[PDB]
Amino acid sequence: PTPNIPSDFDFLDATLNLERLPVEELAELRKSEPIHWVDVPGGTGGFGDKGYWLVTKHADVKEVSRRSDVFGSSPDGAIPVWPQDMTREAVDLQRAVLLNMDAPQHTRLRKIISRGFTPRAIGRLEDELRSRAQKIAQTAAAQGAGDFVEQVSCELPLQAIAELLGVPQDDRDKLFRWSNEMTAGEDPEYADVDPAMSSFELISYAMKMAEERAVNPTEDIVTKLIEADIDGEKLSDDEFGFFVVMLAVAGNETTRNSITHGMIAFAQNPDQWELYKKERPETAADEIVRWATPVSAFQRTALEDVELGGVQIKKGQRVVMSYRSANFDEEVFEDPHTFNILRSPNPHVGFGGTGAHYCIGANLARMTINLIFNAIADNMPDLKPIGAPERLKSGWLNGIKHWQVDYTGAGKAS
Amino acid sequence: PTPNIPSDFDFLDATLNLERLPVEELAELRKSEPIHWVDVPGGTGGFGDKGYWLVTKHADVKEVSRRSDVFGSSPDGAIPVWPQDMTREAVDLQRAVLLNMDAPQHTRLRKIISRGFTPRAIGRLEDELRSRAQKIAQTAAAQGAGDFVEQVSCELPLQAIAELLGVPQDDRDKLFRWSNEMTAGEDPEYADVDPAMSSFELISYAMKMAEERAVNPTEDIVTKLIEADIDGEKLSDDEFGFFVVMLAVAGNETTRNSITHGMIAFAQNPDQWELYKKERPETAADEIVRWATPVSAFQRTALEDVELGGVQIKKGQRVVMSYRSANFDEEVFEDPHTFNILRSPNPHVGFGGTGAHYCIGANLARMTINLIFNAIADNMPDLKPIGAPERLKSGWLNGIKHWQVDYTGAGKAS
Ligand code: HEM
Ligand code: HEM
Ligand SMILES: [Cl-]
């Protein structure tokens, strides 16, 4: 333990993170106790255990990510914190989707699924997503002022998934509503929704899509995921359904927040925004992800006793990787508190550390970021905030729910 | 069509059935148009089709039940009616559970599952369920007056399932709450609950139970369902989970309602109740089921064009079996409107017509009925209703939500 941070301060508490990320407190851990046990003696939400290890240094996050053979994802899932009313049963079945699977099942499925995320499958979407990014940005400009999250940030991540899967235009509204309902989480603005019913309707929709594409193949990835290869490897129709569930939760709010936070960073750093509009540099999307770190943390569970950074971790204890801390590690990044869209090298972990679960959508995500920031630069170069960003109440997803913005930059109607 | 019943009268409408079963209208169909098309031109809830065939004669219900090769259960599920807000996606995935499966998948699973429902596996529960029935009935007697549904009808069906599966006593309250939440349906008293989240927690609980029983076998059925036979046939752990989901919806409200309706019948027919208390006849449980017909109707979907009772049914049309009608067919039952606990023979279809989906729990159900009616006769022989039964709002499950009853039969405290 370390005098500056008492062991009962819970870095993943959703009420705390609603107010602020615990940035200063993470920095004290990096300095003085880089692998730190948090006490939650009355029992953690969902898990029912009495605390967790928090891993705050970049090198150790990469170490945990690389050693999946001792740091598993399936005993407890990757999401590191839940409300007090989450049940152990609801936690235990996160493992129906890729993120929360260990070998051999994860290994087989990730190999199949990687067919969908080649530079070719992703570059094929680029023209359509550019064309959608430009319209999103123009339609929003046309309103003069509004909620930048709903009007600029939200749509392109969901269209990227719709375009990747070849979702019929008439099906997009329900797909998108199921995706948004699925991640209702613990914010009171979303208390009314049914995440499980939404996720059941989505699976059912996706399975029907697999059945159809089996008789009528397409140019989209669905066809490649469900066609047996040399060794008869392919997703079954319900594997495909759980894959679609995976994408809807993996590729929506994460990219949406990288966009919202990127724009906030630009609004706080006008010179970076001038430089952006003028060069469109290729290093910008990665600085945006580092800066947003949309996933603040994900965890593993020790599968046997293991030593890590000189600390003895015992089998069954959770080990939480702070990507928010690691992305500002003073030993890895020069001036980590400067938003620099030319930052290079930029070995951020917003997509995870290299390893079995490294984000499969990462290039699709950078492409989404590049497309919308180009559209914003092209169609609303002078936007300025009218209001404070409102934070999402979550202990692990760095979300912004709303941010009032003047698109014309001069109180204009247009 | 027939002049007395216009084609837009919807026999499965939940608002109509909340007021009454359409008994007189079923009787006109048996007389004049025993296979009858109902028009729902604005689209049926869940299914989105424009109506259904209703099958009202006993012989034709048995015919549809026998011919599973042309009357399938998986295209649309067995439940024959849903509210307008039910989605096609939610319907399409009913087929994750046995009731809604066709061959070959149903065939393999029903064969495995029948290991759990032998006269031996069911007779092994009898002492414990007798002992629980007696306590239920005594604890209720001790209150003098109360809700007969909550206090006498509810518990023994849920304990039968708990005892069948060897559910730990400390787990029964959550199991039972998940079961009750799962069948929330469309009654406003249950609008607040989450059936899908409940059904997800239950699956997860059941899978963990399968994992445990694999390392530590038991005398209960779980062990027999998950042990590979000669040919390596057994439920996988998630098959077991979907099996438990099946039981929680198959074996709770159905038996609960056979008990409630049996007692109402006894209260309306005091001589039958005297005769019961005096002989405990063995034919009583089956007359109670015929009389309650807890499932009013279940359907199939034509898998190809077929002729039935001289009527041409086209592929993809739903064919709804009215068990409520068939159980009062004047050609099969002598005086079907007389509640006679000595009725013999009694070829009722409350458990279905013989065929691939005939109720697997039927003897467990009769045993539950016999046990609780013996306990009621033994411990509250003079009970009398204080209040009208309140109906459940459902178009297909003949439920009673509450019924105020004086257990002492003389306004006594005890
Ligand atoms: C800026 C946006 C995104 C961020 C910050 C992000 C971050 C992450 C992280 C942190 C992980 C876990 C890494 C680990 O445990 O090592 C992950 C995994 C994953 N991501 Fe993303 N992600 C983003 C966008 C997307 C998109 C657009 C998709 C696809 C449409 C996607 C699909 C997935 C999938 C399928 C996994 C699971 C991979 C596996 O478990 O093997 N992600 N992402
Ligand atoms: C009085 C109480 C009950 C009634 C009225 C009832 C009625 C029915 C009916 C009508 C069916 C469909 C028959 C068909 O489609 O031909 C069915 C199926 C089934 N029942 Fe029951 N049931 C009752 C109790 C139970 C109980 C106690 C259990 C077990 C705990 C149970 C387990 C099942 C299962 C698993 C099926 C699906 C069989 C298959 O699809 O192959 N039932 N029941
Ligand atoms: Cl579900």
Which residue of chain A is at minimal alpha-carbon distance from B200? Answer: A90
Q: At what angle do helices B362-379 and B284-292 cross, to 10 degrees?
A: 110
Judging by beta carbons within 10 Å of its beta carbon (0-12, 13-18, 19+), is residue B404 exposed, middle or buried? middle
Length of chain A: 414
Asked if A342 and A288 touch (Cβ cutoff 8 Å), the reply is no
Calculate the dihedral angle through the C-alpha atoms of B173, B178, B180, B185, rounding to the nearest 10 degrees: 170
Count of alpha carbons within 13 Å of B123, Cβ hemisphere only? 3
Min distance A199 CA to chain B CA atoms (Å): 9
Helix (H) or strand (E) holding A320: strand A318-322
The C-alpha R_g of chain A, in whole angstroms, comes to 21
- Report the candidate in A414, A365, A411 with the shortest Cα–Cα distance to residue A384: A411
Ligand 2 atom at minimum distance from B160 CA = 30
Alpha carbon distances (Å) from A97 to A102, A105, A203, A235, A242: 10, 10, 11, 13, 6
Calculate the dihedral angle through the C-alpha atoms of B94, B97, B100, B105, rounding to the nearest 10 degrees: 130
User: Which residues have C-beta within 8 Å of that of residue B232, sequence separation ≥ 6?
Assistant: none
Gap from CA of B246 to ligand 2 centroid (Å): 9
Going by alpha carbons, the residue nearest to atom 11 of ligand 1 is: A359
- Positive or negative, the Cα torsion across A171, A172, A175, A178? negative
Q: How far is CA A150 from the centre of its chain?
A: 17
Q: Distance between CA atoms of A50 and A179, rounded to whole angstroms? A: 32
Gap from CA of A393 to ligand 1 centroid (Å): 21
Residue B275, token pair as written in the block: 């005769």
- Report the candidate in B201, B199, B232, B239 with the shortest Cα–Cα distance to residue B113: B239
Fold of the CATH domain B1-414: Cytochrome p450 (1.10.630)
Residues in chain B closer than 8 A to A46 (CB atoms):
none
Calculate the dihedral angle through the C-alpha atoms of A281, A283, A285, A287, rounding to the nearest 10 degrees: -120
DSSP state string for B52-113: EEEE-SHHHHHHHHH-TTTEESTTT-S-----TT--HHHHHTGGGSGGG--TTHHHHHHHHH
Q: Distance between CA atoms of B343 and B328, rounded to whole angstroms? A: 13
3-state secondary structure of B293: coil
Q: Distance between CA atoms of A79 and A63, rounded to whole angstroms? A: 18
User: Which residues have C-beta within 8 Å of that of residue A326, sequence separation ≥ 6?
Assistant: A55, A56, A57, A58, A61, A62, A332, A349, A353
The neighbouring-strand residues paired with B108 are none
User: Which residues have C-beta within 8 Å of that of residue B271, sequence separation ≥ 6?
Assistant: none
Ligand 2 atom at minimum distance from B321 CA = 15
Peptide bond into A80 cis (omega under 30): no
User: Which residues have C-beta within 8 Å of that of residue A117, sequence separation ≥ 6?
Assistant: A221, A360, A361, A363, A364
Asked if B286 and B348 touch (Cβ cutoff 8 Å), the reply is yes
Q: Is B335 left (phi over 0), alpha (psi -120 to 50) or beta?
A: left
CB contact under 8 A, B90 and A203: no
Count of alpha carbons within 13 Å of B213, Cβ hemisphere only? 24
Q: What is the DSSP letter of A99?
A: G
CB contact under 8 A, A205 and B90: no
Judging by DSSP bridges, how do beta strands A311-313 and A306-308 pair with one another? antiparallel
Alpha carbon distances (Å) from B388 to A146, B142, B384: 57, 22, 11
Going by alpha carbons, the residue nearest to atom 30 of ligand 2 is: B251
Q: What is the DSSP letter of A22?
A: -
Map tokens 């029983």 to a residue. Answer: B213
Gap from CA of A161 to ligand 1 centroid (Å): 13
Q: At A278, give phi and psi (nearest 5°).
A: -70, -45
Residue A356, token pair as written in the block: 């079995």
- Report the candidate in A366, A368, A363, A364 with the shortest Cα–Cα distance to residue A284: A366
- Positive or negative, the Cα torsion across B224, B227, B231, B234? positive
Helix (H) or strand (E) holding B324: helix B323-326
Q: Distance between CA atoms of A123 and A193, rounded to whole angstroms? A: 35
Calculate the dihedral angle through the C-alpha atoms of B294, B100, A207, B302, rounding to the nearest 10 degrees: -110
Judging by DSSP bridges, how do beta strands A51-55 and A318-322 pair with one another? parallel
Asked if B55 and B30 touch (Cβ cutoff 8 Å), the reply is no
Q: Give domain limits for chain B.
A: 1-414
Asked if B289 and B348 touch (Cβ cutoff 8 Å), the reply is yes
Min distance A263 CA to chain B CA atoms (Å): 36
Please name the method used to determine this structure. Answer: X-ray
* Angle value at C-alpha A167, between A161 and A172, nearest 5 degrees: 85
| Final resolution, Å | 2.0
Helix (H) or strand (E) holding A36: strand A35-39
Residues in chain A closer than 8 A to B205 (CB atoms):
89
Length of chain B: 414
User: Which residues have C-beta within 8 Å of that of residue B114, sequence separation ≥ 6?
Assistant: B360
Residue A322's CB: how many other CB atoms inside 10 A? Answer: 33
Pick among A174, A177, A198, A201 to test the B interface (most B CBs inside 10 A): A201
Residues in chain B closer than 8 A to A207 (CB atoms):
92-93
Contacts with A, B 64-93, CB within 8 Å: 87, 89-90, 92-93
Gap from CA of A157 to ligand 1 centroid (Å): 13
Alpha carbon distances (Å) from A233 to A239, A242, B166: 12, 16, 38
* Angle value at C-alpha A297, between A296 and A300, nearest 5 degrees: 170
Q: Distance between CA atoms of A257 and B36, rounded to whole angstroms? A: 56
Strand runs labelled E in B244-368: 297-302, 306-308, 311-313, 318-322
3-state secondary structure of A80: coil
CB contact under 8 A, B197 and A200: no
Q: Distance between CA atoms of B157 and B162, rounded to whole angstroms? A: 9
Ligand 1 atom at minimum distance from A364 CA = 27
- Report the candidate in B174, B295, B299, B153 with the shortest Cα–Cα distance to residue B244: B174
CB contact under 8 A, A200 and B93: yes
Ligand 2 site residues (CB inside 6 A) read: B 65, 78, 98-99, 110, 161, 246-247, 250-251, 254-255, 258, 289, 294-295, 298, 350-353, 355, 357-361, 364-365
Residue B404, token pair as written in the block: 């105020």
Gap from CA of A96 to ligand 1 centroid (Å): 16
Q: Distance between CA atoms of B116 and B227, rounded to whole angstroms? A: 12
Asked if A355 and A78 touch (Cβ cutoff 8 Å), the reply is no
Q: Distance between CA atoms of B172 and B202, rounded to whole angstroms? A: 12
Judging by beta carbons within 10 Å of its beta carbon (0-12, 13-18, 19+), is residue B152 exposed, middle or buried? buried
Residue B60, token pair as written in the block: 């034709």
Asked if A297 and A320 touch (Cβ cutoff 8 Å), the reply is yes
H helices within A227-361, ranges in order? 237-250, 253-268, 270-279, 284-292, 323-326
3-state secondary structure of A54: strand
3-state secondary structure of A85: coil
The neighbouring-strand residues paired with B55 are B35, B321
Residues in chain B closer than 8 A to A199 (CB atoms):
196
Asked if B43 and B49 touch (Cβ cutoff 8 Å), the reply is yes
Residue B119's CB: how many other CB atoms inside 10 A? Answer: 8
Residue A121's CB: how many other CB atoms inside 10 A? Answer: 18
Q: Distance between CA atoms of A338 and A207, rounded to whole angstroms? A: 46
Residue A165, token pair as written in the block: 């899967």
Helices (H) and strands (E) in chain A, counts: 18, 12
Judging by DSSP bridges, how do beta strands B384-385 and A311-313 pair with one another? unpaired
Residues in chain A closer than 8 A to B89 (CB atoms):
200-202, 204-205, 208
Q: Distance between CA atoms of B114 and B360, rounded to whole angstroms? A: 7
Residues near ion ligand 3 (Cβ under 5 Å): A 196, 200; B 196, 200
- Positive or negative, the Cα torsion across A82, A86, A92, A94? negative
Asked if A82 and A46 touch (Cβ cutoff 8 Å), the reply is yes
User: Which residues have C-beta within 8 Å of that of residue A110, sequence separation ≥ 6?
Assistant: A98, A356, A360
The neighbouring-strand residues paired with A406 are A145, A384
- Report the candidate in A201, A204, A231 with the shortest Cα–Cα distance to residue A112: A231
* Angle value at C-alpha B93, between B91 and B99, nearest 5 degrees: 90
Q: Is A228 left (phi over 0), alpha (psi -120 to 50) or beta?
A: beta
Q: Exposed e or buried b for every residue in A221-245, given b needs 16+ CB within 10 A?
A: bbbbbbeeeeeeebbebbbbbbbbb
Asked if A390 and A398 touch (Cβ cutoff 8 Å), the reply is no
Amino acid of residue A390: E
Q: Distance between CA atoms of A398 and A157, rounded to whole angstroms? A: 16
Amino acid of residue A336: P
User: Which residues have C-beta within 8 Å of that of residue B187, sequence separation ≥ 6?
Assistant: B392, B393, B394, B401
Asked if A360 and A370 touch (Cβ cutoff 8 Å), the reply is no
User: Which residues have C-beta within 8 Å of that of residue A93, sequence separation ≥ 6?
Assistant: B200, B203, B204, B207
Pick among B76, B173, B177, B201 to test the A interface (most A CBs inside 10 A): B201
Q: At A198, give phi and psi (nearest 5°).
A: -60, -40
Ligand 1 site residues (CB inside 6 A) read: A 65, 78, 98-99, 110, 161, 246-247, 250-251, 254-255, 258, 289, 294-295, 298, 350-353, 355, 357-361, 364-365
Asked if A330 and A94 touch (Cβ cutoff 8 Å), the reply is no
Q: Distance between CA atoms of B1 and B189, rounded to whole angstroms? A: 37
Q: Distance between CA atoms of B284 and A225, rounded to whole angstroms? A: 57
The neighbouring-strand residues paired with B71 are B302
- Report the candidate in A310, A313, A370, A316 with the shortest Cα–Cα distance to residue A341: A370
Contacts with B, A 92-151, CB within 8 Å: 92-93
Q: At B224, give phi and psi (nearest 5°).
A: -70, -30
Which residues of B fall in the annotated binding site for heme?
A: 359
Residues in chain A closer than 8 A to B196 (CB atoms):
194, 196-197, 199-200
User: Which residues have C-beta within 8 Å of that of residue B338, sequence separation ≥ 6?
Assistant: none
Map tokens 């003389």 to a residue. Answer: B410
User: Which residues have C-beta within 8 Å of that of residue B276, sequence separation ≥ 6?
Assistant: B266, B284, B341, B373, B377
